[PDB]
């Protein structure tokens, strides 16, 4: 097997000349030369089998990415794993090489309005497709927005995705208030909130709603949006949450133009509509694409949707890790030599 920085990366003979890129979640990521397609690709090593939660996320990501086909969503090109379930300990997922991500970019670069608009278009175009499949991504953040050298953007990491019907993360700053308040009845609107947080961060190079825990983040949200109105408070279906919010001192709205006065006024108008406290008043993906800020891109004939809504055969939340291993073995089989 080929070796990378201490660890087995057993992807030859098809994939060679490995180069460590970094860490994903359950393994390292390398770039490799694909000797069949004659191009460099990305390969992520996943080792999920000893943990039920890692297996659920791996199965979710594989099933969704194999079903989706869209320019602004990362694909799965190939999957390498052992020929028998007993020998399978690691799974290697092969994808288009994307040289950076919005998280890395924002670390060093102040983006022009032109690039902010172009990125925001691509994010919404991919998200239109995800939502049309009846899927919620639930974990949109800059590090999940991959970029190549010519500003093409692809959404990745569907480990936490769910089919819509009204979990540890390192990064909490893109989560909707209704999620942090434990409200009953989440929708696609949680993804629009995340995109709004991303747009704000493209405008300023720092998270707009940081905080050490959900209560600190809620304080940052209310410090900008202002205290919720009575009707928006009532949208929170959690009495303990409503009481907590009522316990806080009153805060006036800080207009977005005061925070980001360099920003395009149309960008701020759309930001305002994505970052509404009440999810029922939050702009939807199709309406966002149709917003004046995006007018130079907006093209419904060139913004495709899924052929039919996505459907999980089984609820995964309940399944033992051994059953999940069987499903991952089945799901990955199409890439095997001699598959039929």
From Swiss-Prot:
Effect upon mutating residue 215 to A: Inhibits interaction with TPR
Annotated effect of mutating residue 168 to A: Inhibits interaction with TPR
Ligand binding (ATP): 21-29, 44
Effect of substituting residue 302 to N: Inhibits interaction with MAP2K1 but not with TPR
UniProt domain Protein kinase: residue ranges: 15-294
Keyword Membrane attributed: yes
Disease listed for this protein: Noonan syndrome 13: A form of Noonan syndrome, a disease characterized by short stature, facial dysmorphic features such as hypertelorism, a downward eyeslant and low-set posteriorly rotated ears, and a high incidence of congenital heart defects and hypertrophic cardiomyopathy. Other features can include a short neck with webbing or redundancy of skin, deafness, motor delay, variable intellectual deficits, multiple skeletal defects, cryptorchidism, and bleeding diathesis.
PANTHER family: MITOGEN-ACTIVATED PROTEIN KINASE
Annotated family: Belongs to the protein kinase superfamily. CMGC Ser/Thr protein kinase family. MAP kinase subfamily.
Designated name of the protein: Mitogen-activated protein kinase 1
Species: Homo sapiens
């Amino acid at each position: 097997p080929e070796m990378v920085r201490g660890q087995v990366f057993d992807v030859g003979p098809r994939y060679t000349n490995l180069s460590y890129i970094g860490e994903g979640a359950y393994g390292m990521v390398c770039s490799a030369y694909d000797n069949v397609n004659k191009v460099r690709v990305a390969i992520k090593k996943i080792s999920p089998f000893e943990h039920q939660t890692y297996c659920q996320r791996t199965l979710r990501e594989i099933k969704i990415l194999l079903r989706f086909r869209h320019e602004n969503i990362i694909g799965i090109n190939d999957i390498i794993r052992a020929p028998t379930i007993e020998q399978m300990k690691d799974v290697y997922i092969v994808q288009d090489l994307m040289e950076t991500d919005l998280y890395k970019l924002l670390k060093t670069q102040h983006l022009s309005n032109d690039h902010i608009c172009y990125f925001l278009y691509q994010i919404l175009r991919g998200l239109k497709y995800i939502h049309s499949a009846n899927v919620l991504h639930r974990d949109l953040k800059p590090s999940n927005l991959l970029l190549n050298t010519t500003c093409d953007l692809k959404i990745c990491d569907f480990g936490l995705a769910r089919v819509a019907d009204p979990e540890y993360v390192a990064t909490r700053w893109y989560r909707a208030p209704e999620i942090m308040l434990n409200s009953k009845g989440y929708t696609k609107s949680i993804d629009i909130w995340s995109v709004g947080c991303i747009l704000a961060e493209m405008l300023s190079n720092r998270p707009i709603f940081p905080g050490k825990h959900y209560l600190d983040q809620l304080n940052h949200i209310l410090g900008i949006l202002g205290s919720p109105s009575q009707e928006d408070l009532n949208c929170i279906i959690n009495l303990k949450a409503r009481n907590y919010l009522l316990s806080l001192p009153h805060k006036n709205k800080v207009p977005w133009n005061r925070l980001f006065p360099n920003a395009d006024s149309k960008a701020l108008d759309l930001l305002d509509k994505m970052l509404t406290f009440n999810p029922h008043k939050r702009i939807e993906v199709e309406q966002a694409l149709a917003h004046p800020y995006l007018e130079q891109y907006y093209d419904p004939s060139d913004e495709p949707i899924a052929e039919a809504p996505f459907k999980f055969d089984m609820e995964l939340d309940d399944l033992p890790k051994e059953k999940l291993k069987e499903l991952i073995f089945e799901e990955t089989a199409r890439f095997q030599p001699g598959y039929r």
